[PDB]
Every structure is written in structure tokens, then in C-alpha cells.
Design an enzyme around this catalytic site. Sequence first.
Site, mmCIF file in Angstrom:
data_model
loop_
_atom_site.group_PDB
_atom_site.id
_atom_site.type_symbol
_atom_site.label_atom_id
_atom_site.label_comp_id
_atom_site.label_asym_id
_atom_site.label_seq_id
_atom_site.Cartn_x
_atom_site.Cartn_y
_atom_site.Cartn_z
ATOM 1 N N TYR A 1 -9.214 -6.174 8.129
ATOM 2 C CA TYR A 1 -7.869 -5.832 9.171
ATOM 3 C C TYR A 1 -8.267 -4.506 8.816
ATOM 4 C CZ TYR A 1 -4.990 -5.359 5.072
ATOM 5 O OH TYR A 1 -4.302 -6.055 3.963
ATOM 6 N N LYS A 2 -7.950 -3.949 10.033
ATOM 7 C CA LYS A 2 -7.744 -2.388 10.336
ATOM 8 C C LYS A 2 -6.694 -1.618 10.465
ATOM 9 C CE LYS A 2 -11.885 -1.158 12.416
ATOM 10 N NZ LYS A 2 -13.242 -2.034 13.980
ATOM 11 N N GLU A 3 -6.180 -0.402 9.752
ATOM 12 C CA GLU A 3 -5.134 0.046 9.191
ATOM 13 C C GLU A 3 -5.536 2.053 9.631
ATOM 14 O OE1 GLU A 3 -2.461 -2.159 6.318
ATOM 15 O OE2 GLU A 3 -3.497 -0.452 5.493
ATOM 16 N N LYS B 1 6.136 8.241 5.293
ATOM 17 C CA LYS B 1 4.379 7.379 5.357
ATOM 18 C C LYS B 1 4.607 6.337 6.613
ATOM 19 C CE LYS B 1 -0.050 7.248 3.527
ATOM 20 N NZ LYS B 1 -0.547 6.998 2.261
HETATM 21 N N1 LIG Z 1 -2.875 3.465 2.416
HETATM 22 C C1 LIG Z 1 -2.749 1.938 3.383
HETATM 23 C C2 LIG Z 1 -3.584 1.508 1.325
HETATM 24 C C3 LIG Z 1 -3.301 -0.217 1.697
HETATM 25 C C4 LIG Z 1 -2.956 -0.294 2.521
HETATM 26 C C5 LIG Z 1 -3.218 -2.419 2.590
HETATM 27 C C6 LIG Z 1 -3.886 -2.842 1.340
HETATM 28 O O1 LIG Z 1 -4.031 -3.975 1.116
HETATM 29 C C7 LIG Z 1 -3.939 -1.903 0.036
HETATM 30 O O2 LIG Z 1 -3.939 -2.170 -0.824
HETATM 31 C C8 LIG Z 1 -3.850 -0.458 -0.404
HETATM 32 O O1 LIG Z 2 -0.715 4.642 2.144
HETATM 33 C C1 LIG Z 2 0.743 3.560 1.513
HETATM 34 C C2 LIG Z 2 0.336 2.556 1.914
HETATM 35 C C3 LIG Z 2 0.878 1.593 1.093
HETATM 36 C C4 LIG Z 2 0.392 0.091 1.345
HETATM 37 C C5 LIG Z 2 0.575 -0.154 3.102
HETATM 38 O O2 LIG Z 2 -0.185 -1.812 2.748
HETATM 39 C C6 LIG Z 2 -0.442 0.672 3.880
HETATM 40 C C7 LIG Z 2 0.110 2.110 3.222
#
Ligand SMILES: NCCc1ccc(O)c(O)c1
Ligand SMILES: O=Cc1ccc(O)cc1
EC number: 3.5.99.14
Lengths: 155, 173, 173, 155
Positions: free
Chosen positions: D69-71, D83
Site C-alpha cells: 500500500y501507499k501512505e 501527525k
Molecule cells: N510513517 C509511516 C510509518 C509506518 C507506516 C506503516 C507501517 O506498517 C509501518 O510499520 C510504519
Molecule cells: O509516522 C508515523 C506513523 C506510524 C505508523 C503508521 O501506520 C503511520 C504513521
Amino acid sequence: STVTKVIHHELEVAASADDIWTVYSWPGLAKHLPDLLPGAFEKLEIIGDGGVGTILDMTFVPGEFPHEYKEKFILVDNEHRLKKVQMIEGGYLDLGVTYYMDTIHVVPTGKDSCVIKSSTEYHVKPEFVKIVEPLITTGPLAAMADAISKLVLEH
Amino acid sequence: SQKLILTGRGIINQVSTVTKVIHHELEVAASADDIWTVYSWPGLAKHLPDLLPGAFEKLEIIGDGGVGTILDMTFVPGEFPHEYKEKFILVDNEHRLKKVQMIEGGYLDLGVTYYMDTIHVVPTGKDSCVIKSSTEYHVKPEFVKIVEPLITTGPLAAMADAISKLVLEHKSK
Amino acid sequence: SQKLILTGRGIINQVSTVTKVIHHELEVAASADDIWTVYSWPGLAKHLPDLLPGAFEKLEIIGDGGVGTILDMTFVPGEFPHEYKEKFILVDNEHRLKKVQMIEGGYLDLGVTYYMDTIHVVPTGKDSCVIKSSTEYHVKPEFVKIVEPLITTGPLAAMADAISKLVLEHKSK
Amino acid sequence: STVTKVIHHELEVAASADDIWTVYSWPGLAKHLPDLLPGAFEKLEIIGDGGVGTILDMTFVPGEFPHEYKEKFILVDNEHRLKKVQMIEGGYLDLGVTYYMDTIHVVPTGKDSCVIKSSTEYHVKPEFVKIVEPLITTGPLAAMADAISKLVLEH
Ligand SMILES: NCCc1ccc(O)c(O)c1
Ligand SMILES: O=Cc1ccc(O)cc1
Ligand SMILES: NCCc1ccc(O)c(O)c1
Ligand SMILES: O=Cc1ccc(O)cc1
Ligand SMILES: O=Cc1ccc(O)cc1
Ligand SMILES: O=Cc1ccc(O)cc1
Ligand SMILES: [Cl-]
Ligand SMILES: [Cl-]
Ligand SMILES: [Cl-]
Ligand SMILES: [Cl-]
Ligand SMILES: [Cl-]
Ligand SMILES: [Cl-]
Ligand SMILES: [Cl-]
Ligand SMILES: [Cl-]
Ligand SMILES: [Cl-]
Ligand SMILES: [Cl-]
């Protein structure tokens, strides 16, 4: 500032210009390029229905130059049996080539004969003409001409 | 629109090459130790886009930054090499000697069968050193005309200068 | 902007599954022979986007369309399975039996350890047959709640209907 | 029509909210996620400088759900030490989830203590609440909280 270079290849065929042109203008041709040219591509991606506007992304086996480039099916003229295909990304465009175009023109000679006239025009920066000159040949167009004629001749 | 991908599936000729070596040397007013610690830093790879801004369109680091690490480097449109992979072969702390081998893509598709970069940081005094960066490649003789103008000490020289800048802008350990 | 890619590098638990079989049957007014020739056609794979328009965002065919061929299928956003690979395991002309195995992605990431599709085209008369399409999968028992609603005979039924349509729209050999 | 679900996790830390927030708000954190969480990712692509607007594309090892997935780093509020990170493609969005948002809020308790309050809100189609309910947990946020606190506590 670019230098213009044009290279040509001709192939005589004991079939009608219409029978050859039918293959070249066929939208289903793109998906059959690996059949037509076995072992030429490592990977061929077809983006579109095979008609004008279609993009082909061609990846070749390690060791070959171009490793990868994209081609776009830009123009079809059925009356004149003429097809234009531009290199739009990668390949020679990364070696000072600013423009790269293939033209295929199937010209009738007799009633059941024709000549496939293929050519490629490119524009190069003078700093690169000595580098790319030896790399760019009519090979891809010749391979296509040979394979299509053989498909049509043998029926 | 629709995307369809179709993927199919000389023992003396391959070593019929000539060997070329190109050498670069940057002598700089910093210690061998200071310059080496940047070069041998496992975190260096992930900071290459910071060290060399606008050099890469994409950079992939496979591994921990130490020996064995593979770097897959993609360059912006128009640039030659568009893409290649390099592998960290040697990080020798005692001699201040680093070896990096091009393993796929780039010049290996233009008649080159072997391409090895060596960086040796040599003291010339208490607060000065030479960064000796060299490229040894083997090419099929009939691509020497093609490939020699393309292969330069450019990327090695760019690295040497960028690392030197970092250090000479006196930061610390 | 900058793209940086960082790629790092229970023996009873893995077979602690329950076996589920789901069956689909389409009886159609065409011969087993006519239906089978489409199914066993090596050119079928590259024509799946034509056969099933709007099913795929991307389709990759690795191999010649015969046994051993791998299909990498990517589906449009929002759809589950987003992506998986399948492999042609068996194309048995004598029995009109085809086997296709999901080898990576899709349900294999949701507790499924094994997923095999079988298509058997059986005569029911001179101009009629049943397309028996079944899916056998093995799942860890604690994902049965999750994955059963998702695994349906949908894609196999879609294939059976589309091929039947083609044939019943009487074209030729 | 969607159902709204909110899940929470809290973690007490024997460090100041400012010392924890410094790590969470650090633009260099993205490129250090594999260091912070060893073996969590098969592949992590960082698109951007690590600050607000950055996209992370996360690929996990075979067998794991989400595979990919994309975040997107959507919002930073330094005053409130808050945040927000949205899932924008793949993962649960392919299982009837129409909205997926993580919120991290570092709240001071004493002078040298704080609570990391992490939460995830998502909206699901009712046809999928029973399917995704068991899949979506505070795991990713907990893992981050644990790793950051351990980094700050041990110095
Ligand atoms: N800043 C994103 C940090 C993050 C997001 C999704 C995850 O599964 C993870 O282990 C860590
Ligand atoms: O940067 C913080 C963070 C941690 C876990 C997440 O799933 C998303 C953001
Ligand atoms: N219609 C494009 C046909 C084509 C283009 C480039 C090639 O190298 C080739 O072998 C064939
Ligand atoms: O479709 C015709 C064609 C053949 C060879 C090329 O290189 C380009 C187009
Ligand atoms: O300093 C090592 C090095 C790494 C990658 C390169 O491209 C060149 C040199
Ligand atoms: O008919 C074989 C077949 C191929 C691909 C699929 O996804 C399903 C069935
Ligand atoms: Cl076709
Ligand atoms: Cl190329
Ligand atoms: Cl290249
Ligand atoms: Cl030396
Ligand atoms: Cl010394
Ligand atoms: Cl999936
Ligand atoms: Cl049966
Ligand atoms: Cl029979
Ligand atoms: Cl950093
Ligand atoms: Cl996923």
C-alpha cells in the site's frame, strides 16, 4: 542544433502491396510481434488496442543496445499504404538523438508484386553523430519486412 | 487503456576484449582518515541523493550499505547510462580501498564485459590525501570507438568532489 | 521529485490447514470439443483482455500459452485480489482437463497455502456439455471467516460464460 | 454508505513529549524506517524529502496482508505534536475501505514523561466490515511507538 540523418531499406516481395499492407496495418500485429520475431524481445508491453495511438515498450536481452525504448504508432495512411512509428522514450534518445522516426511504405510494383520501402529519420547533436552513427541501422525495419513477407509468401 | 505484457523465455568471443584503465586523482586538504570514513560509511548509499542532488531519477539500495550491497541507479531522461546496477565488492579499512563493480546495464550493453571502480584514499601528509579513483573495463575492440567517449571518470570524480566538499566544510565525527 | 527504494534481504504450521472445494458447472448447448478447443488454445492467454474486457488493469504472459505459462494479473484499484500469478499446470487433451494454480499473491497472502483451479469439459450429448470448473484451496482454519466470502467461483464462472458466448455465437475452426 | 471505525493505542514513555515528537516529526525518519523496524518491509519506496507531502510505498514479504500500500504524509502540527498519515492506495482500500487515516499525538504527562496516543480511523462498506474488522489493527502504529520510544530511552 542537430544534424539530420536518413537511412533506407527496400525489400521486393512476390505478393500484392495490399496483401503486405494488410499485415502492416493490422491492429492485432503488435500482440503478435514475439510470434513474428522469435527471441527478439525479452519483454514487450503493449499499451492500447494495436491501432494508431498505441505505445510499445520493448525490453531486450542483456548485452544488446538499446536495452529498452518506447515506440508510438503515430500515423496510418491506408490509401498510400504508409505507416509512421516514433521512438518516444529511451534507446537512442539518451545518446543525443532528439528525434527518431520510422516510416514504412508498401509500394505496388506489378499486380502481384510490391516493394516494402522502410526508412528511419533521426536528428542528432553533432557531439553524438560519431557515437550513434554506428549504432543506428535499418535492422528492426528489415527484420519486420523479412518476417511479414515470409508470413504472406508461405501463406 | 489496456496494458498487455508478453515475456518470452561464444566461449572465446566473450573474453575477446581489450583492457582500458582510466585514472582520476583528487588531492585535497583533508586527512585520508576523514575522507575514508565518509567513503566507508554504510549509510553513504542512502544519502547519495543528498550528496549528489539531481543526479538520480530513482535509486534503489539492496542490502545494508556494506560489502554485498547492490545499487540500482536510474538517471533522468536524455542521460546515458539510463540505468545500471553496481555492487560493493570490497570495503578494505586497512588500505582505505573500496571496490564497486557494475554488474548489469549501462556500458555492459555496449560491448563492455567487465567494469570495476576502485577508490584508494592515500595520505600525502598529516592533513592532506589523494583520492585515487580508477575505472578498469574490458571491451570488445570494435566498441572502443563507441564507448570510450561515453566512459569518463565523471561519476567517480563527482563523488570525490562531493565527499571532499562535505569534509572540507568541517563537520565532525 | 526524489525516489528512493530501500530493499532489505513452522514446518507443521504451514500444513495446518483445512481443505475447501467450491464447484461451478455451466451446462451449455455446444459440443465438449468446441468448448475444449478454446480452453486448450495456447493463444487464449493473450486474448483474455479481449475475452474479458475491463477485467484487467494489466496482464503479463510469461511463456508460450501452453503448460508452464505464468500469468501475472493486476486488477483495477478497489478490486480484491489486486494482483496474483497463476501457472498452467496441466492441459490434458484426452480428458478435456485443464489445471491452473495460483502461485503468488492474492489469497496466498490471506492464510491460503494452496489454490488450484481445475476445468473439466464433459459431454452431455452430441451438441451439449458441462464445463465443470472447481477451486480447491487449503487455508489456515482461522482465516476461513476472512477468506471464504472473498473466494468465489466468479473468475472461473466468468471464463466459462465468456468462452460459451464465443462458441454459441457460432464462429468456426 | 459507510460505517466509521476508530481504534486506539497508547504508550507511556519515560521521556519528554518534545524528545519523542522530535523523532516522529523528523523528515529523515522515512529513510530510517528499515533501521527502526528491521524485517518489517520487503521493499520501501520513499517519494519526496520525508516531510509533509511525502508518499511511502510499502511492500511486505509473501504471506503477509497488506502485501502493498501507499501512505501519504498529510499533516504536521508541531504545537500540538500531532501527525496525520493517510493510506491512499492498495491494502485495505481494495477490501471496501473508502477512507483510512492514522493519527499520532504525543501528549506530555510530566516534565520528562509523555503518552504516545496513536489511532486509526477508517470508513467501511457494511458488506466488508466483517471481512476487514479482523484484519485492521493498531499493529503498525504500536510498532512505531515501541521503536521510537526505545530509540529515545536508550539514547
Ligand atoms: N510513517 C509511516 C510509518 C509506518 C507506516 C506503516 C507501517 O506498517 C509501518 O510499520 C510504519
Ligand atoms: O509516522 C508515523 C506513523 C506510524 C505508523 C503508521 O501506520 C503511520 C504513521
Ligand atoms: N511495430 C513496431 C515493430 C518493431 C519495432 C522495433 C523493433 O526493434 C522491432 O523488432 C519491431
Ligand atoms: O510496424 C512497423 C515497424 C517495423 C519496425 C519498426 O522499427 C517500427 C515500425
Ligand atoms: O563510493 C562508492 C560509489 C558508490 C556508487 C557509485 O555510483 C560510485 C561510487
Ligand atoms: O482457462 C484457464 C484460466 C486462465 C486464467 C484464469 O485466471 C482462469 C482460468
Ligand atoms: Cl488478434
Ligand atoms: Cl537503452
Ligand atoms: Cl542504459
Ligand atoms: Cl595506488
Ligand atoms: Cl597510513
Ligand atoms: Cl492482492
Ligand atoms: Cl469430473
Ligand atoms: Cl468423449
Ligand atoms: Cl537523514
Ligand atoms: Cl495488498
